[PDB]
Amino acid sequence: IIIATKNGKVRGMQLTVFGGTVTAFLGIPYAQPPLGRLRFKKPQSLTKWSDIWNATKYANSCCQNIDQSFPGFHGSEMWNPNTDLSEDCLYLNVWIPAPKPKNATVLIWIYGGGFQTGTSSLHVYDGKFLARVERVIVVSMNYRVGALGFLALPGNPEAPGNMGLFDQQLALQWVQKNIAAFGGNPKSVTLFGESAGAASVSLHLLSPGSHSLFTRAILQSGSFNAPWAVTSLYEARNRTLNLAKLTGCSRENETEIIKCLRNKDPQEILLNEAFVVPYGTPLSVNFGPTVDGDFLTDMPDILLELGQFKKTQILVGVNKDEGTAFLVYGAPGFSKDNNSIITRKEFQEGLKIFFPGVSEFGKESILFHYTDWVDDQRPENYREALGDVVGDYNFICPALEFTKKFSEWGNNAFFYYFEHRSSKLPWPEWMGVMHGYEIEFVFGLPLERRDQYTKAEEILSRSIVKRWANFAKYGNPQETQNQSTSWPVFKSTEQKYLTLNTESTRIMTKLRAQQCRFWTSFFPKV
Ligand SMILES: *[C@@H]1O[C@H](CO[C@@H]2O[C@@H](C)[C@@H](O)[C@@H](O)[C@@H]2O)[C@@H](O[C@@H]2O[C@H](CO)[C@@H](O)[C@H](O)[C@H]2NC(C)=O)[C@H](O)[C@H]1NC(C)=O
Ligand SMILES: *[C@@H]1O[C@H](CO[C@@H]2O[C@@H](C)[C@@H](O)[C@@H](O)[C@@H]2O)[C@@H](O[C@@H]2O[C@H](CO)[C@@H](O)[C@H](O)[C@H]2NC(C)=O)[C@H](O)[C@H]1NC(C)=O
Ligand SMILES: *[C@@H]1O[C@H](CO[C@@H]2O[C@@H](C)[C@@H](O)[C@@H](O)[C@@H]2O)[C@@H](O)[C@H](O)[C@H]1NC(C)=O
Ligand SMILES: *[C@@H]1O[C@H](CO)[C@@H](O)[C@H](O)[C@H]1NC(C)=O
Ligand SMILES: *[C@@H]1O[C@H](CO)[C@@H](O)[C@H](O)[C@H]1NC(C)=O
Numbered sequence: 314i315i316i317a318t319k320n321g322k323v324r325g326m327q328l329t330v331f332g333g334t335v336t337a338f339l340g341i342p343y344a345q346p347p348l349g350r351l352r353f354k355k356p357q358s359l360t361k362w363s364d365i366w367n368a369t370k371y372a373n374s375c376c377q378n379i380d381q382s383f384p385g386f387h388g389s390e391m392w393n394p395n396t397d398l399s400e401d402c403l404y405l406n407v408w409i410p411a412p413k414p415k416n417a418t419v420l421i422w423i424y425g426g427g428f429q430t431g432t433s434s435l436h437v438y439d440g441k442f443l444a445r446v447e448r449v450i451v452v453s454m455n456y457r458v459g460a461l462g463f464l465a466l467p468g469n470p471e472a473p474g475n476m477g478l479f480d481q482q483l484a485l486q487w488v489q490k491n492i493a494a495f496g497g498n499p500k501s502v503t504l505f506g507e508s509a510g511a512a513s514v515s516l517h518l519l520s521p522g523s524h525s526l527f528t529r530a531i532l533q534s535g536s537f538n539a540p541w542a543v544t545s546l547y548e549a550r551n552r553t554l555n556l557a558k559l560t561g562c563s564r565e566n567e568t569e570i571i572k573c574l575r576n577k578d579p580q581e582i583l584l585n586e587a588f589v590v591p592y593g594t595p596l597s598v599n600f601g602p603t604v605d606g607d608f609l610t611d612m613p614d615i616l617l618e619l620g621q622f623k624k625t626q627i628l629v630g631v632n633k634d635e636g637t638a639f640l641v642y643g644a645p646g647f648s649k650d651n652n653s654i655i656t657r658k659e660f661q662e663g664l665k666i667f668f669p670g671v672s673e674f675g676k677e678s679i680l681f682h683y684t685d686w687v688d689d690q691r692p693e694n695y696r697e698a699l700g701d702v703v704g705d706y707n708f709i710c711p712a713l714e715f716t717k718k719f720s721e722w723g724n725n726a727f728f729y730y731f732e733h734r735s736s737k738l739p740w741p742e743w744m745g746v747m748h749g750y751e752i753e754f755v756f757g758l759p760l761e762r763r764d765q766y767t768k769a770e771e772i773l774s775r776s777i778v779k780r781w782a783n784f785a786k787y788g789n790p791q792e793t794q795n796q797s798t799s800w801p802v803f804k805s806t807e808q809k810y811l812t813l814n815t816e817s818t819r820i821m822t823k824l825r826a827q828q829c830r831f832w833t834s835f836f837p838k839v
């Protein structure tokens with residue numbers, strides 16, 4: 314139960330799952346901790362050790378602001394970090410099947426959180442059910458978020474930008490050099506993540522230094538062409554210097570600002586991160602991926618459009634009600650505690666919150682496209698409209714356009730539409746199939762009947778886990794043995810996609826066709 318890696322021995326622990334055993338190695342370090350001189354730098358290789366590292370508990374989460382908008386509410390607190398925050402957080406986790414497999418496919422998980430939050434130690438990210446049920450090895454890693462992971466002064470190796478993407482990339486290399494010792498096949502590595510984690514997975518498809526570190530990709534509710542995912546390199550510099558003044562760290566030697574920011578206390582940087590943008594939205598990515606000239610050599614949209622990415626199979630998908638979660642973090646007349654029926658003027662107020670820097674005409678064009686009704690006095694007309702707007706603009710339409718663009722360079726792609734509202738979902742029912750609430754199905758939590766899910770949820774999670782596993786091993790997300798719906802390839806022309814629900818599973822075409830022609834062709838011009 315001790316494994317010898319390239320930097321020394323590590324001790325794990327075994328776990329009982331479904332009357333079998335999984336071996337967990339929680340908290341293997343994969344880089345020299347990025348403190349002091351190393352804060353804001355790319356991660357550095359990890360010096361050998363001759364003891365036995367004890368990988369028996371999750372390591373520290375990375376520094377980050379907590380969501381304190383619904384204290385005590387499980388719906389928001391289940392996403393808050395559940396281990397000590399620290400700048401010493403570059404660690405990873407590995408769940409291997411027991412008995413040790415011999416050439417197992419490796420699934421590498423990248424959590425979301427808008428590039429400002431998240432941690433690999435969340436309960437819904439527990440890879441033990443996947444290791445037990447599909448006999449894959451599951452790896453997740455922590456990576457720097459917010460200013461600590463994405464502060465950008467282009468070219469300056471003191472704060473080059475994209476450091477958190479490089480933490481991810483060094484985790485992938487760790488798996489390349491070391492996963493053979495755990496019984497895994499480095500030649501069969503599938504990346505999957507959700508939200509900002511999905512956008513990260515898509516950026517690894519573009520970054521040449523990641524080409525050789527993984528085989529396939531799975532993108533849940535996210536991609537790099539979402540409007541919140543990448544920021545221009547000049548908007549990045551404006552933000553790092555606005556943080557510089559806010560901490561009184563202003564200089565004309567850019568390098569001297571960095572070493573000034575290197576002496577400030579993480580809490581001081583965290584509490585100023587929010588204000589480096591002129592007007593915030595509940596979707597703001599204050600510090601995030603940029604075109605840095607190293608991880609990312611051009612605007613991702615050019616690279617996607619011109620076929621400059623890793624050629625491979627992708628699995629891409631979204632939830633029915635991506636946008637609702639954000640409405641109760643700032644939209645007036647909205648609350649998780651009533652059913653949030655809003656008015657036409659409340660709707661228009663909501664647009665100013667989510668599209669603050671957008672012209673009067675832009676906002677009416679949004680209102681005009683979403684507010685001519687199949688019936689004008691459904692009292693929830695404007696409430697549903699505002700949720701669709703946020704979800705279609707921020708998630709569904711970027712994921713559809715990514716998939717279109719990706720598949721027209723010849724690779725197989727599969728698109729799902731997740732529309733089961735979980736029975737354990739703590740938010741009110743008007744919020745529907747919320748952002749992030751497919752993750753528990755992917756990780757196979759409903760497989761554990763000890764814990765509150767209907768039998769129908771267990772069965773739906775059982776096939777999702779099988780399709781995901783079959784996609785990782787074989788490049789094809791079919792459930793073959795149980796007479797399931799066949800998942801058609803998503804072609805650029807007909808655009809078939811698969812719906813995922815408890816009743817049964819249907820092939821449909823051209824998800825949100827009218828809404829996406831608005832968002833992806835009209836609205837970019839305004
Ligand atoms: C680029 O940065 C300037 C400077 O930023 C601001 O100062 C920070 C400390 C923080 O308080 C931000 O909210 C400020 O915006 C921005 O310039 C300003 O515009 C805002 C409102 O638009 C105004 O409050 C400030 O007085 C302006 N500051 C100056 C120095 O004139 C600017 O908006 C940023 N954005 C872009 C796109 O360049
Ligand atoms: C739904 O609730 C929102 C606000 O949630 C509430 O906040 C307090 C007002 C309190 O009543 C809590 O118990 C509620 O759950 C309501 O929005 C408020 O409306 C008033 C109207 O005078 C306005 O002044 C406030 O700013 C609003 N609060 C906001 C925008 O956060 C809303 O009216 C409720 N609607 C329904 C149909 O129940
Ligand atoms: C590492 O841990 C050793 C203890 O072994 C076991 O660790 C966990 C799983 C506990 O359940 C404990 O009862 C076990 O015996 C220590 O002997 C060793 O000193 C530790 N090393 C370091 C560096 O802390
Ligand atoms: C694992 O599979 C690869 C091909 O996918 C092969 O080249 C390698 O030798 C295998 N290793 C084993 C079976 O230990
Ligand atoms: C000041 O800036 C120059 C580049 O213009 C740089 O070479 C120098 O190292 C900076 N000062 C310090 C103390 O590093």
Ligand SMILES: *[C@@H]1O[C@H](CO)[C@@H](O)[C@H](O)[C@H]1NC(C)=O
Pocket residue numbers: 775776779792795
């Ligand atoms: C197939 O169906 C059986 C029930 O007949 C179920 O127990 C099994 O787990 C299913 N397999 C998959 C991959 O869903």
